[PDB]
Amino acid sequence: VETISFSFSEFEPGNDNLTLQGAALITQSGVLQLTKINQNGMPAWDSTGRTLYAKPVHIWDMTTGTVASFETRFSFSIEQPYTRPLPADGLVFFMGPTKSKPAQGYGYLGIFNNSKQDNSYQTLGVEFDTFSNPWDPPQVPHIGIDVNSIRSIKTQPFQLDNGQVANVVIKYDASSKILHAVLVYPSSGAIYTIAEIVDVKQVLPEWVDVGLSGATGAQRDAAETHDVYSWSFQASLPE
Amino acid sequence: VETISFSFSEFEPGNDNLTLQGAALITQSGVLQLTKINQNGMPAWDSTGRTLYAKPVHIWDMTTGTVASFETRFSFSIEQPYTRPLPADGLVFFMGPTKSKPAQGYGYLGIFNNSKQDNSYQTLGVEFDTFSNPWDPPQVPHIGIDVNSIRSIKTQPFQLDNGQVANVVIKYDASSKILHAVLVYPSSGAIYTIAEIVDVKQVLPEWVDVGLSGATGAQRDAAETHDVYSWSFQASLPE
Ligand SMILES: *[C@@H]1O[C@H](CO)[C@@H](O[C@@H]2O[C@H](CO)[C@@H](O[C@@H]3O[C@H](CO[C@H]4O[C@H](CO)[C@@H](O)[C@H](O)[C@@H]4O)[C@@H](O)[C@H](O[C@H]4O[C@H](CO)[C@@H](O)[C@H](O)[C@@H]4O)[C@@H]3O[C@@H]3OC[C@@H](O)[C@H](O)[C@H]3O)[C@H](O)[C@H]2NC(C)=O)[C@H](O[C@@H]2O[C@@H](C)[C@@H](O)[C@@H](O)[C@@H]2O)[C@H]1NC(C)=O
Ligand SMILES: *[C@@H]1O[C@H](CO)[C@@H](O[C@@H]2O[C@H](CO)[C@@H](O[C@@H]3O[C@H](CO[C@H]4O[C@H](CO)[C@@H](O)[C@H](O)[C@@H]4O)[C@@H](O)[C@H](O[C@H]4O[C@H](CO)[C@@H](O)[C@H](O)[C@@H]4O)[C@@H]3O[C@@H]3OC[C@@H](O)[C@H](O)[C@H]3O)[C@H](O)[C@H]2NC(C)=O)[C@H](O[C@@H]2O[C@@H](C)[C@@H](O)[C@@H](O)[C@@H]2O)[C@H]1NC(C)=O
Ligand SMILES: OC[C@H]1O[C@@H](O[C@H]2[C@H](O)[C@@H](O)[C@H](O)O[C@@H]2CO)[C@H](O)[C@@H](O)[C@H]1O
Ligand SMILES: OC[C@H]1O[C@@H](O[C@H]2[C@H](O)[C@@H](O)[C@H](O)O[C@@H]2CO)[C@H](O)[C@@H](O)[C@H]1O
């Protein structure tokens, strides 16, 4: 059995186990700020940042046909300081091709280049979408399961607890092919759940990079924070 | 669309919307005690109690072949006062044939008569099992998805926060046939998730009674409390 795991109770600046891209930055206080925060302490618009674990993960094996079960947990907070314009764009946990660089920002969240469902993307993502694009349901924010497209195959709206820490648990059972995600706000006690069948062998390459990506809007002040406090991951390939 | 829903933020003694069976009782403080609590305030062993919503639920239609999606949420607390003997047996949320009466207690949790996987049971349940019977995994307590048998098709162990309130969310998406359950302990912040594919048309009758059942052990002091603080349910039959 091939197993890989990591656990960051907090982030340390200078750590070489994480690949920071775009605006991503680790503060001295141990927080991972996916998108830029100005000198005045306000979140900057037109910003995209990602963080990928420095080691590729063996998600499935073509020879044996076996696929890994995995689980990831993380805590984040989104703060929307302005009433207008509407805040944007959200953050996302994703798995895709190794050695990747940031894609389009804004509504594409740094992982897609358009709104097509293209198999060449080879990307699986669980989004926490704060802005309603034309391909999105009307309700925002919403959790979404993205399979080779920004147009989620399943969506679940949730109420944002402004500036409060949300706990996330995403689990994938290879046997049943069920990807189940949970969002909990300890502050309000709110619990949200979403699940859908996803056969990763049809989506992802055998080896993938796992990461988090965030993006702010396309116009002045259409922004919010995308701060991550901790992140752990574990995967087991029965092989 | 046939829709049914109910929400009990607390329980009122005398309410005629709930059918209490066995030891089940609603206290003046608004708590539903599934199993018996003695005069000395300790939980009694050899006790079984259930509570069923007074109206049957239309879960699926044979004619159109459509099946309902549903969601239930509830809060409970289990208190284990003794180090020995081991506490037992647990509680369970279930759906089964209408007009049913309590079955075998103990490890059968009041909903099964043996440990066979019998289609005539026509019962679907999500258990919170505190005692390890020969048909159970070694780890207790554990969440379990029961389909026509006390021998769960899927199990998820969890750590009991003695006497603390646990929040539960169980959701079923008829389209994907995914039954997903979540347990959260606000006290410790612990989150547990379990999911499995279940086609209810193969298990349940078209109309079912929904309820909660609890049971204490087969020997002196093999007991614990099974208190429920709130319970809501909603179901929608696209028809
Ligand atoms: C977070 O970042 C940490 C720092 O980068 C990670 O820890 C490093 O993990 C490396 C494993 O990839 C590990 O590398 C090995 O280092 C050996 C020498 O250092 C040890 O021994 C010294 C005395 O001999 C001692 O002074 C040190 O303090 C260490 O105890 C070295 O012998 C190994 O080389 C062998 O294996 C490689 C690979 O097959 C061969 O190339 C080599 O010929 C030899 O056979 C190995 O060296 C690394 O090899 C690859 C090369 O490119 C690297 O430059 C070279 O360093 C390294 O020791 C530790 N660093 C420390 C300070 O402990 C950490 O990884 C996790 O934790 C480690 C301990 C290990 O369990 C990993 O599997 C974990 O992933 C990162 N954490 C996470 C979650 O990613
Ligand atoms: C929790 O328990 C509550 C108390 O039992 C539930 O509320 C009851 O819900 C009953 C619906 O099943 C409802 O029954 C109807 O009562 C009508 C008369 O009472 C009303 O109007 C009076 C003045 O006319 C007024 O004084 C009262 O305060 C009420 O406002 C009556 O007209 C209805 O009869 C018609 O429909 C039935 C069914 O087709 C026919 O049989 C009948 O011929 C007529 O056409 C109906 O009466 C009930 O009919 C069935 C019979 O066996 C019953 O004995 C008879 O009562 C009842 O009024 C309320 N009670 C109160 C105090 O409001 C509650 O149900 C939920 O809430 C209600 C309001 C409704 O929305 C339900 O659909 C909900 O489920 C329970 N809550 C839950 C979550 O289960
Ligand atoms: O406002 C945030 C929102 O912007 C969308 O892009 C807009 C842009 O804001 C507007 O100034 C320009 O005229 O039209 C663009 C196209 O709609 C992004 O698409 C959306 O993701 C958010 O970033
Ligand atoms: O001890 C709680 C546990 O009892 C099991 O039943 C036992 C019983 O406790 C013991 O006194 C008797 O001799 O044998 C019984 C069969 O194992 C129940 O099966 C279990 O569910 C718990 O209730």
Ligand SMILES: [Ca+2]
């Ligand atoms: Ca969007």
Ligand SMILES: [Ca+2]
């Ligand atoms: Ca048991």
Ligand SMILES: [Mn+2]
């Ligand atoms: Mn979206």
Ligand SMILES: [Mn+2]
């Ligand atoms: Mn069990």
